[PDB]
Design a protein around this ligand. Structure first.
Ligand SMILES: *[C@@H]1O[C@H](CO)[C@@H](O[C@@H]2O[C@H](CO)[C@@H](O)[C@H](O)[C@H]2NC(C)=O)[C@H](O)[C@H]1NC(C)=O
Ligand SMILES: *[C@@H]1O[C@H](CO)[C@@H](O[C@@H]2O[C@H](CO)[C@@H](O)[C@H](O)[C@H]2NC(C)=O)[C@H](O)[C@H]1NC(C)=O
Ligand SMILES: *[C@@H]1O[C@H](CO)[C@@H](O)[C@H](O)[C@H]1NC(C)=O
Ligand SMILES: *[C@@H]1O[C@H](CO)[C@@H](O)[C@H](O)[C@H]1NC(C)=O
Lengths: 97, 49, 49, 196
């Protein structure tokens, strides 16, 4: 129970990545949730793995296992408008935009 | 209230600090020693599966 | 060898990620103006240092 | 005095014929020289403000290169050569080019950072090997007389700065490469909140 010769067999397995679905990620020490995509980036270097924003957000990343660049997008999180009348029993729903 | 969808799985990525031990490469060597000259090897500061 | 210090630097990036300009924000008054306006060539005006 | 073990004692002298020289070059961060890339992120067509450990513009350098011929003095392992790592250092190294039968070889001095430099603590050591760097940062047992020899046109002494029969325990181990035909190299070292 003391040393540095540990095994990554049961610690955390790597299986695959998912596309077009809001999923959680714990990439390179930073966590978040969102939807990934697939782009053709050429601005990555040997030591660069993330593409960051100018305000403190993540724009994309690159998986070193298969050498392809992605693009992380935030998924929908919004509210709905509901119109209601006193004499009525149901509601009128409106999803804006 | 807002509509926040839940994630379906978890995706993690990390870069390993120490290299792999490569125990299988040493255990599959073609020069099999005799019990009279058994071989000994020390492994430390590496990762193995 | 030269020492280091916790300072603030204005970094300019190109369309590929290569750093092209860096401003110390503490060398002269023009550097402070540039880092206050968050631009390499500030606009015409009167500022308080 | 850096270590505590007695690794070797062949030629021990006591002379004071060295002094750090102040360089004539001035730090110019106009075009990027002196600044470092951020952690493994990418910025595109933006202008940012970063609060970090940087050198001061309009400053002078100091040399700490030591070279000898089988003779080592006790004053070489003390101040001002054994400087203090207050918050960080930025170093410029000259790529010494040698030729052995019309074959290019590159080698420069090595750096060792630590706290007490004993086996009970960690110690970072960076040294090149013919165009290949080596960063270990392991709990090495270094003696108070560390040195390093040249592989090309070797010296009388032998490279002996640590005495460890088995590899001690540590967290990091990795090799790096660089162009052997360059002339100047740059290095940045610092720490923050216990992270080096
Ligand atoms: C880098 O960013 C600048 C600033 O947004 C871009 O300059 C703009 O370019 C568009 C398209 O040509 C023009 O309509 C704007 O008027 C420009 N604004 C300014 C302030 O110049 C520039 O195109 C970007 N470069 C790249 C390669 O995308
Ligand atoms: C980093 O490079 C050094 C130098 O090439 C490697 O050290 C060599 O290791 C082999 C294998 O044990 C020895 O046969 C050589 O004698 C070593 N050379 C020197 C100069 O020490 C080291 O193994 C490399 N490390 C990694 C992780 O690749
Ligand atoms: C939404 O549904 C469409 C239709 O099946 C599908 O193509 C898309 O991937 C879905 N998006 C998410 C985030 O579930
Ligand atoms: C990804 O690129 C790096 C650097 O070019 C290379 O070392 C590595 O083998 C590549 N991996 C794959 C799966 O192509």
């Amino acid at each position: 129970n003391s040393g540095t010769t540990c095994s990554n067999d049961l610690l955390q397995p790597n299986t695959e990545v998912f596309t077009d679905v809001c999923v959680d990620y714990d990439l390179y020490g930073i966590t978040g949730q969102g939807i990934f995509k697939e782009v053709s980036a050429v601005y990555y270097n040997s030591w660069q793995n993330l593409l960051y924003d100018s305000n403190g957000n993540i724009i994309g990343f690159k998986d070193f296992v298969t050498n392809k660049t992605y693009n992380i997008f935030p998924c929908y999180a919004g509210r709905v408008s509901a119109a209601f009348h006193q004499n009525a029993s149901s509601l009128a729903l409106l999803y804006r935009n | 209230s807002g509509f926040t969808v839940k994630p379906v799985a978890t995706v993690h990525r990390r870069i390993p600090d120490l290299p792999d031990c490569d125990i299988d490469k040493w255990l599959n060597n073609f020069n099999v020693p005799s019990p009279l000259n058994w071989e000994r090897k020390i492994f430390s500061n590496c990762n193995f599966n | 060898v030269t020492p280091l210090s916790k300072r603030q630097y204005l970094l300019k990036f190109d369309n590929r990620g290569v750093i092209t300009n860096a401003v110390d924000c503490s060398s002269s008054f023009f550097s402070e103006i540039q880092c206050k306006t968050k631009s390499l060539l500030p606009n015409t005006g009167v500022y308080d240092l | 005095v850096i270590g505590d073990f007695n690794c070797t004692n062949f030629a021990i002298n006591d002379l004071n014929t060295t002094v750090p020289r102040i360089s004539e070059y001035v730090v110019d961060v106009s075009y990027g020289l002196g600044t470092y890339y951020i952690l493994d992120r990418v910025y595109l067509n933006t202008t940012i403000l970063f609060t970090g450990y940087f050198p001061k513009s309009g400053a002078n350098f100091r040399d700490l290169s030591l070279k000898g011929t089988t003779y080592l003095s006790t004053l070489w392992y003390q101040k001002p050569f054994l400087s203090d790592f207050n918050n960080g250092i930025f170093s410029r190294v000259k790529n010494t080019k040698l030729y052995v039968n019309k074959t290019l070889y590159s080698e420069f001095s090595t750096i060792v950072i630590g706290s007490v430099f004993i086996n009970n603590s960690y110690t970072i050591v960076v040294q090149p090997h013919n165009g290949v760097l080596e960063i270990t940062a392991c709990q090495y047992t270094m003696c108070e007389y560390p040195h390093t020899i040249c592989k090309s046109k070797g010296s009388s002494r032998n490279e002996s700065w640590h005495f460890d029969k088995s590899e001690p325990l540590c967290l990091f181990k990795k090799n790096f490469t660089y162009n052997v035909s360059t002339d100047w190299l740059y290095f940045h070292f610092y720490q923050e909140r216990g992270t080096f």
